[PDB]
């Protein structure tokens, strides 16, 4: 296959629409890995997505330690 | 309440050099002759690759410090503080803020210089992280510090109202919470005015980003001198080698070629050494920036003149071309007044020392007050402790102490 | 290894060894080849020394950082964030390794959080009450005071609260009762 990235042209890798942690950095936010029996090039995932409940009169207090 | 700006460089520009094109051009005879000098280019490639990976390591260490990406809730009330200029703006396609846009715009037929340098074997590689990812990291850090506080730097993010967070920080610097709870509106107005002044200064002044511009200028000057070195004879007949080959016989052409090769190799060596030194300095700056990010943004620092000039309250990060910008919010006293003091109070033949504050007098009476704010109170046994008689301490004075129990005995 | 391998270069001379150069050419002419070889080898060795100096400087910086970490994290307790580990620092231990040190950091991390409703101050008898070293919480029916980093509810009293001003200036104040521990024993 052929793929056009801002770092050039990539031949031999198939582009997928998922996102994983980077294994081999190619550049411009594009990384590559060996998975599935094949080589897949993907876009980096910064991390999990979270939201915090904020209001005038709410607090969170811990009840245990490690 | 004061807001101060700090600028720190983080990374550099990644470069790659092609030996054969730079030295021998498009001549095959020089290409054949070059092999005699051994392995002089694998070392150069290794050094440049090391610098290139070092830059990405620097950026990742500085910015990637949060495991989860947070978002601010749609409601934008934070106790009167605006924050609308430093939070992401969804309208623009870059998902950036006003100050970030100003900072990026601040630092900047015919053929472009980049193409001309590329056509001689000097190329620039792209960084691993785009600007959007750095913006997302900055937004996540801002959301975490606004909503959770410093709890997200040591575990899970626990929500807390902004006013109570400010009260905790005031307690940290050494002032009680009632000051904030009674001057919330004034503090919010001061913060908004300071942010507006920062806006005006950024929009007007164009010389506050010197360090990143100096980095860019140094890189440009190094490339310029490397390119200019190609047009010097080094003691030969001419710089152009085809004329040397055509004009005169091989016996002296070999000497001329050797002179040119030695000169160009020496120039490349000098360039690599200067690049190594500059990269070491940039890495030191990046380490300092990472430490500052971990100490001033994810917590409160007691160190003096580290996270701002004054008493530190908190800080905010923003991105910049090849660098980071810190907005420090700090506390400074004003409108001071003179008073008369004593070290202890001798009452009932016993010495009395304050528990938290200091003793003051306004001319006739005596009070106890906190250190960083004028708030007098009557000297009682609840805010005083006794140790020994009053004939040893130098400078003790006479007064009376109030006991909150005897009034209740008779009433 | 690369310094050793550089010895096979010719640097434009007729051979990579000296004895054959001295055993094939007259003294008037061998000088140019000897000069070329000597200059090349000197340049290689100088480059090696310079790179060694730079690497030594970096190692010195790392050693200074390790010394500071040993001074603060091990011999004492550090309040710096993310310096002696992730979390709240408790203590640390050193161990040795070939050309390096290994630090084991023992730290404290909260877990098992729970939601609560809070107010900044309590209005009682026309006066505002603020916590001393805690925070006000409520479980939907009653009110308590608890420490920040652990759950330990307690009854609001005079001993753990202080008063300043009226209750018509603080935003978010609520009405409740503050228990006086002097009258009940006085009236008994």
UniProtKB/Swiss-Prot annotation, chain B:
UniProt effect for mutating residue 382 to H: In strain: Alpha/B.1.1.7
Disulfide bonding pattern of the chain: 19-41, 24-30, 296-307, 346-390
Coiled-coil stretches: 213-257
Reported impact of residue 123 to N: In strain: Lambda/C.37
Positions marked as site (Cleavage): 96-97
Chain segments carrying region Heptad repeat 1: 184-234
Glycan-linked positions: 82, 338, 362, 398
Function, in words: Precursor of the fusion protein processed in the biosynthesis of the S protein and the formation of virus particle. Mediates fusion of the virion and cellular membranes by functioning as a class I viral fusion protein. Contains two viral fusion peptides that are unmasked after cleavage. The S2/S2' cleavage occurs during virus entry at the cell membrane by host TMPRSS2 or during endocytosis by host CSTL.
Protein name, per record: Spike protein S2
Organism in which the protein naturally occurs: Severe acute respiratory syndrome coronavirus 2 (2019-nCoV)
Lineage, uppermost ranks: Viruses, Riboviria, Orthornavirae, Pisuviricota, Pisoniviricetes
Gene name for this UniProt entry: S
Segment of the intact protein contained: 720 to 1147 of 1273
């Amino acid at each position: 296959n052929v793929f056009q990235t801002r770092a050039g042209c990539l031949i031999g890798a198939e582009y997928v629409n998922n996102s994983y942690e980077c294994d081999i950095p190619i550049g411009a936010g594009i990384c590559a890995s060996y998975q599935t029996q094949s080589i897949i090039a993907y876009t980096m995932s910064l991390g999990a997505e979270n939201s915090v409940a904020y209001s005038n009169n709410s607090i969170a207090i811990p009840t245990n330690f490690t | 309440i004061s807001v101060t700006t700090e600028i720190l460089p983080v990374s550099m520009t990644k470069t790659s050099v092609d030996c054969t094109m730079y030295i021998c051009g498009d001549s095959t005879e020089c290409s054949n002759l070059l092999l005699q000098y051994g392995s002089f280019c694998t070392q150069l490639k290794r050094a440049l690759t090391g610098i290139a990976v070092e830059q990405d390591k620097n950026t990742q260490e500085v910015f990637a410090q949060v495991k989860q990406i947070y978002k601010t809730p749609p409601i934008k009330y934070f106790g009167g503080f605006n924050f609308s200029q430093i939070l992401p703006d969804p309208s623009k396609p870059s998902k950036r803020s006003f100050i970030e846009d100003l900072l990026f715009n601040k630092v900047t037929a015919a053929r472009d210089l980049i193409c001309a340098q590329k056509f001689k074997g000097l190329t620039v590689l792209p960084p691993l992280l785009t600007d959007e990812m750095i913006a997302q990291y900055t937004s996540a850090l801002l959301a975490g510090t606004i909503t959770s506080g410093w709890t997200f730097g040591a575990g899970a993010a626990l929500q807390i109202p902004f006013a109570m967070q400010m009260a905790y920080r005031f307690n940290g610097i050494g002032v009680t919470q009632n000051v904030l709870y009674e001057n919330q509106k004034l503090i919010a107005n001061q913060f908004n005015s300071a942010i507006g002044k920062i806006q005006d200064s950024l929009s007007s002044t164009a010389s506050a980003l010197g360090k990143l511009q100096d980095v860019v200028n140094h890189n440009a000057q190094a490339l310029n001198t490397l390119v200019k070195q190609l047009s010097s004879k080094f003691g030969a007949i001419s710089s152009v080698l085809n004329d040397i080959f055509s004009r005169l016989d091989p016996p002296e052409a070999e000497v001329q070629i050797d002179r040119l090769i030695t000169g160009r190799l020496q120039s490349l060596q000098t360039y690599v050494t200067q690049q190594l030194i500059r990269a070491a300095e940039i890495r030191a700056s990046a380490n300092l920036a990472a430490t500052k990010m971990s100490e001033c943004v994810l917590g409160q620092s007691k160190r003096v003149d580290f996270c701002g000039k004054g008493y530190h309250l908190m800080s905010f990060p923003q991105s910049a071309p090849h660098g980071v910008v810190f907005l420090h919010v700090t506390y400074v006293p004003a409108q001071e007044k003179n008073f008369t003091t004593a070290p202890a109070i001798c009452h009932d033949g016993k010495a009395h020392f304050p528990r938290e504050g200091v003793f003051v007098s306004n001319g006739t009476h005596w009070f106890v007050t906190q250190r960083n704010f004028y708030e007098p109170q009557i000297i009682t046994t609840d805010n005083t402790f006794v140790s020994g008689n009053c004939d040893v301490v130098i400078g003790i004075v006479n007064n009376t102490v109030y006991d909150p129990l005897q009034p209740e005995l008779d009433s």
